[PDB]
Design a protein around this ligand. Structure first.
Ligand SMILES: [Mg+2]
Ligand SMILES: [Mg+2]
Ligand SMILES: [Mg+2]
Ligand SMILES: [Mg+2]
Ligand SMILES: [Mg+2]
Ligand SMILES: [Mg+2]
Ligand SMILES: [Mg+2]
Ligand SMILES: [Mg+2]
Ligand SMILES: [Mg+2]
Ligand SMILES: [Mg+2]
Ligand SMILES: [Mg+2]
Lengths: 153, 50, 31, 107, 63
RNA sequence: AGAUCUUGGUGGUAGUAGCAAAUAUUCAAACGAGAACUUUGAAGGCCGAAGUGGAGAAGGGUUCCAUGUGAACAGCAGUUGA
């Protein structure tokens, strides 16, 4: 399939993809921006820490109403959160990408997340009921995710 | 209700019989253009005519 | 027959609740 | 050692002071679990049903002020688990809490 | 695994409410294998299903 | 380019308002990849016979029962479900 940002050498690189994933696009985009450029081990332990609420992801663009935390000072930011579902989805994608690296036969102790991209998926419709006999949308915001890992040390 | 007439019971019987999914082998026919039974009815979503 | 090992564990199975609940009468397996 | 068992007394009154009526017994269970974690260094803490009954003995809001418990650190080496140690907290009925120290108890 | 059917059948056979039906928490698989009222009766005979006594409402204070 | 134009699609608002009527949950275990919500047991409570109990009429029409699944739905979840 066509990824954006094809790797500079598709022999030291492995790919992972997911479509129509039932996680919030904004939280997932912030988490992907947080883990972008990380070594794979660092990213894995960081996502586990996000799940355990020991490290936060900084909410930089989609930060409307997002509260302040002390762990956001690690980044140059003030607003951060701990999206558990986004962290788990990215952890599953990282495991899949590491398995792909194993299949391609390149050691997984030198992989760095060079490309990660979160795109909006087709929204799914649900229904909510309002005061005066009115109906309002209750849309979900799923996301496609893709990532390219590359060997470097 | 529990008390019902024979004609009402027969009407409901036909509705029950025709409220079912399409067979799987329909989609393999030449030039089907049918994906699913679009006339499916749920007892709670939409109510019968009577 | 009952010995000390059998008695000390029997006390457990007959108690199926706290104070004020009926004791278990039997647990018999038969095929 | 690491299969040690000790007898403590916990000031439930102190750890529950200020908690609303419908939360006092659940918070007492949470504080007992936190106390066990802090004392024995084990995230895996099991609470005996007799201990739970002892905490809930006087209803949801009139929790006992002090409670005498026994923390036993035991091997979890029964399956593939992240933790190889766990703490079982049992209930020790006492008649008075005066002059009760934290005591190492043998097997 | 899930013993809702067994609790309902035990209540019907024992002619009591589901409050008073006691299923053995250790013999969960054996009780789960019971899918008929005959098997419920056999479990009642064997002692895996017990009718709990009526909660005490004493009248000594009233007397 | 306009017609509070017609139909369709998409933003900011915004991860915001909100998921606050009727006292209340807790412990252990089982199944399970996964348990705040399923099941079992123990405990603490509520309805308190003008009931949150047991049965009917009208209305519904298969929702009843067993087994299986975990796509969508059950405005969190679910191993559960009308
Ligand atoms: Mg705002
Ligand atoms: Mg509404
Ligand atoms: Mg209306
Ligand atoms: Mg209706
Ligand atoms: Mg135009
Ligand atoms: Mg809010
Ligand atoms: Mg609210
Ligand atoms: Mg009352
Ligand atoms: Mg009634
Ligand atoms: Mg049913
Ligand atoms: Mg839901």
């Amino acid at each position: 399939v066509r990824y954006s940002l094809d790797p500079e050498n598709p022999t030291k690189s492995c790919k992972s993809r997911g479509s129509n994933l039932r996680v919030h696009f904004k939280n997932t985009r912030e988490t992907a921006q947080a883990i972008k450029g990380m070594h794979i081990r660092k990213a894995t332990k960081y996502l586990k820490d996000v799940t355990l609420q020991k490290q936060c992801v900084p909410f930089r663009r989609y930060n409307g109403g997002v509260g302040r935390c002390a762990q956001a000072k690690q980044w140059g930011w003030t607003q951060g959160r701990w999206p558990k579902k986004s962290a788990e989805f990215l952890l599953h994608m990282l495991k899949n990408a590491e398995s792909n690296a194993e299949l391609k036969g390149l050691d997984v102790d030198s992989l760095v997340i060079e490309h990660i991209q979160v795109n909006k998926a087709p929204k799914m419709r649900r229904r909510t009921y309002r005061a005066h006999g009115r109906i309002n949308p209750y849309m979900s915001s799923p996301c496609h995710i893709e990532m390219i890992l590359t060997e470097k040390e | 209700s529990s008390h019902k007439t024979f004609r009402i019971k027969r009407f409901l019987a036909k509705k029950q019989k025709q409220n079912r999914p399409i067979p799987q082998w329909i989609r393999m026919k030449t030039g089907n253009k049918i994906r699913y039974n679009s006339k499916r009815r749920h007892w709670r979503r939409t109510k019968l005519g009577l | 027959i009952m010995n000390q090992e059998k008695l000390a564990k029997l006390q457990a199975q007959v108690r199926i609740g706290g104070k004020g609940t009926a004791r278990r009468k039997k647990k018999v397996v038969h095929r | 050692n690491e299969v040690v068992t000790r007898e403590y007394t916990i000031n439930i009154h102190k750890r529950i002071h200020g908690v609303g009526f419908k939360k006092r017994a659940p918070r007492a269970l949470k504080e007992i679990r936190k106390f066990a974690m802090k004392e024995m260094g084990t995230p895996d803490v099991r609470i005996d049903t007799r201990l739970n009954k002892a905490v809930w003995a006087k209803g949801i809001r009139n929790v006992p002020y002090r409670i005498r418990v026994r923390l036993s650190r035991k091997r979890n080496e029964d399956e593939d688990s992240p933790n190889k140690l766990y703490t079982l907290v049992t209930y020790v009925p006492v008649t008075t809490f005066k002059n009760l120290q934290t005591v190492n108890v043998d097997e | 695994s899930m013993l809702r059917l067994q609790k309902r059948l035990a209540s019907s056979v024992l002619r009591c409410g589901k409050k008073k039906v006691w299923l053995d928490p250790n013999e969960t698989n054996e009780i789960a294998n019971a899918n008929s009222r005959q098997q419920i009766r056999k479990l009642i005979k064997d002692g895996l299903i017990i009718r709990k006594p009526v909660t005490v409402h004493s009248r000594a204070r009233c007397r």
